[PDB]
Design a protein around this ligand. Structure first.
Ligand code: HEM
Ligand code: HEM
Ligand SMILES: Cc1cc(N)nc(COc2cccc(OCC3CCNCC3)c2)c1
Ligand SMILES: Cc1cc(N)nc(COc2cccc(OCC3CCNCC3)c2)c1
Ligand SMILES: C[C@H](O)[C@H](O)[C@H]1CNc2nc(N)[nH]c(=O)c2N1
Ligand SMILES: C[C@H](O)[C@H](O)[C@H]1CNc2nc(N)[nH]c(=O)c2N1
Ligand SMILES: [Cl-]
Ligand SMILES: [Cl-]
Lengths: 362, 362
């Protein structure tokens, strides 16, 4: 049955991929080649063209992503050749470097060898290649609470964090055959961080807030034509709200809204004063201002929504069905000021796509 | 089949209603009475107790309502006895008066005779008993655009609006047997309006904004035990965002955000300045402040969310399944600052409930 799934998915993908690439006539021969290869080896190997476009199609089908307009300009790095943890580490290091691009962020995906028969060749433990550690012990909470479990797992493996609020987690991944994952400290020269300041309010720097430049999802599975790339880290640039309205605002994250209200000089006593709402706006203005001042790529949620509208138009123009998750597409601040809020979306799963997978820790 | 639907719904409602009222033992006899009455007349008549609790159950099942905590304190006015348009008008006038309660708004529903065999006894054309007219002609737009079609329909019937931005629409409803609906101008002494001022910014009054005190939905069908009350106007108090973030903010409504940005002294040039977001906050602070200053009941979205959390707890406590529409429950500003955003809801339709129905105009 597993083979049948692979072949069925392969047929659907190769047809669709080759149609889009204008290689329609080559479908029959390519499928035959694949049909034998599956019959022989229990799997098949993508061409670079199929892989590159498959990763682009997968971004295009990401229902929760508001930034899908630029799906076709995705930078794909093919690292199916890696065999050693040294190679994995250097690929991950390289991904950070080239994607960061001195602030002018390049949407990039590095693709590692896929699962053979459910067996992972490489298993990345990081949720993001760049993320802050989190600590919770006897009342004392430090750093990013969302990283508490991974941090504890890393401290099992001989790593120790400095316990600032912004400890960079090391890269941690496990190779096929090894029982334990290895970990490597990130070179600080590879990680751009942005100090959060406010354009008008000088006291905002007293919060001593900062965030990393590049969000690189590293725990999701890329599925292309029945092939499971469990290790394929990808990145874009931040939408400001992700940092200002969530990472730094959520009670179960950095929980900074009360201190923001204090530095911007407003009371945090009454719900009717809408101080949380005011704090969210100024903090999100601070985030956008800070990234721009440092020359690190970022987009506000209004501009992002406009771009997503173009994506919707582009999709209809090309005769493709649009899919999307309304609950995720709406920004967490002023969503009714975007068009997204005022229309509906089909939340169907189309492949190729990126999927969740179980954590090896926890 | 229609009778079978009525009887099936009647069985489900009477059982459930009487369980909750602790009148469990009376279910059998009451159902027999109903079974004969349906067999005889093609319908059945609710007791005052069933009607009152049915309307309360219906509010409790309103998936899109964030204010369901106070479902059991709903003030039910039984006007199934009305036969004349004079009686309908005076009932509607009375509803406005008693619900307004000099600002201390009482959640109230006035229930008119139900459909007999799909035939409406009374047909209310108003979307809300109190709403502003809207005009669009050769480029010129005046008032509330959402009322454009109803306003045009009213001006067919001999009514004429003054064409201010806040013309009160007349009550307009049609009686069984009449081809045309009648219309009655609202007494201004019955309608509380709130001038919008800002607590800190004096120039906000230059916008000359205002809104009516009491939102009274009048075009929805209340369904109770198979009985269709197509005319049953209900009201609560406003959540501030409904006015500040939607009615006065939407481009297809009053579209006031640019003028708000001007009076609060910020530029409306760059998306990255988040001026819309800032304008939304100050305008919503203005709305809340204004209603409080006038002693007209209103609730901010944070407090409302807290109350809705209690409703969720109350529901689990009493062993009732919770249903809700996530897309409607989240407030249009700072939704991620509420618990609603961070959990999911089953959007199943439970009866009794309130439903949409076709407009007689349009
Ligand atoms: C170009 C800049 C990009 C922007 C501004 C953007 C924007 C967003 C945002 C705001 C989210 C929601 C994240 C959250 O709430 O946690 C998101 C989710 C997502 N984006 Fe993008 N994105 C970008 C690039 C990409 C790229 C390059 C890919 C992959 C090829 C991608 C795939 C996804 C996926 C899979 C999710 C869902 C993750 C999840 O389920 O939690 N995006 N995007
Ligand atoms: C007590 C004060 C109340 C508050 C603060 C409240 C809050 C809300 C809000 C904010 C909405 C969304 C409206 C919109 O976005 O257009 C809503 C919808 C709704 N509420 Fe309530 N509500 C209250 C009382 C009531 C009452 C008394 C009923 C009926 C018995 C009711 C039934 C509904 C229904 C049926 C809807 C959905 C209307 C639609 O589908 O568009 N609510 N409520
Ligand atoms: C590619 C990208 C761009 C962007 N602007 N922002 C992001 C952030 O995306 C996130 C941020 C946090 C969680 C998440 O979901 C992936 C995990 C998978 C395991 N379950 C929890 C969610 C995805 C990514
Ligand atoms: C009872 C109540 C309380 C409250 N705070 N706010 C409202 C406002 O509710 C609305 C406000 C606008 C539209 C609407 O929906 C009913 C119509 C039915 C016909 N289709 C369009 C929506 C419901 C009601
Ligand atoms: C398409 C989408 O369902 C629509 O814009 C909804 C979203 N959530 C909402 N929520 C409320 N309270 N009121 C609304 O009118 C809407 N509109
Ligand atoms: C329960 C609900 O789906 C959950 O809170 C979602 C809502 N929408 C979201 N949207 C984004 N972009 N990111 C999120 O983490 C969430 N969380
Ligand atoms: Cl993030
Ligand atoms: Cl309204």
């Amino acid at each position: 049955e597993e083979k049948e799934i692979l072949w069925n998915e392969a047929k659907a993908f190769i047809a669709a991929c080759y149609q889009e690439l204008g290689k329609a006539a080559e479908v029959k021969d390519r499928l035959a080649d694949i049909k034998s290869e599956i019959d022989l080896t229990g799997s098949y190997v993508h061409t670079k063209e199929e892989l590159e476009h498959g990763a682009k199609m997968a971004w295009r089908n990401s229902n929760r992503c508001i930034g899908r307009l630029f799906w076709n300009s995705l930078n794909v790095i093919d690292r199916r050749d890696v065999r050693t943890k040294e190679e994995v580490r250097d690929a991950l290091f390289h991904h950070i470097e080239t994607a960061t691009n001195n602030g002018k962020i390049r949407p990039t995906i590095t693709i590692f060898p896929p699962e053979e028969k459910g067996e992972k060749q490489v298993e990345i433990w990081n949720h993001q290649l760049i993320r802050y550690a989190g600590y919770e012990s006897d009342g004392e909470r430090i750093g990013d609470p969302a990283s508490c479990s991974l941090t504890a797992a890393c401290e099992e493996l001989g790593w120790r964090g400095e316990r600032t609020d912004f400890d960079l987690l090391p890269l941690i991944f496990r190779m096929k055959g090894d029982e334990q994952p290895v970990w490597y400290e990130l070179p600080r020269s590879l990680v751009i961080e942005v100090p959060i300041t406010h354009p008008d309010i000088e006291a905002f720097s007293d919060l001593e807030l900062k965030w990393y430049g590049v969000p690189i999802i590293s725990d999701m599975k890329l599925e292309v034509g029945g092939i499971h790339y469990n290790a394929a880290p990808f990145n874009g640039w931040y939408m400001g709200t992700e940092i200002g309205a969530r990472n730094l605002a959520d009670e179960k994250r950095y929980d900074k809204l009360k201190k923001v209200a204090s530095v911007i000089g407003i009371a945090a006593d009454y719900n009717t004063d809408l101080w949380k709402d005011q704090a969210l706006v100024e903090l999100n203005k601070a985030v956008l201002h800070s990234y721009k001042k440092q020359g690190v790529s970022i987009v506000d949620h209004h501009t992002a929504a406009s771009q997503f509208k173009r994506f919707e138009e582009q999709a209809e123009e090309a005769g493709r069905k649009l899919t999307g998750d309304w609950t995720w597409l709406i920004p967490p601040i002023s969503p009714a000021a975007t068009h997204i809020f005022h229309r509906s979306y089909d939340n169907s799963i189309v492949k190729p796509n990126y999927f969740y997978q179980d954590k090896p820790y926890e």
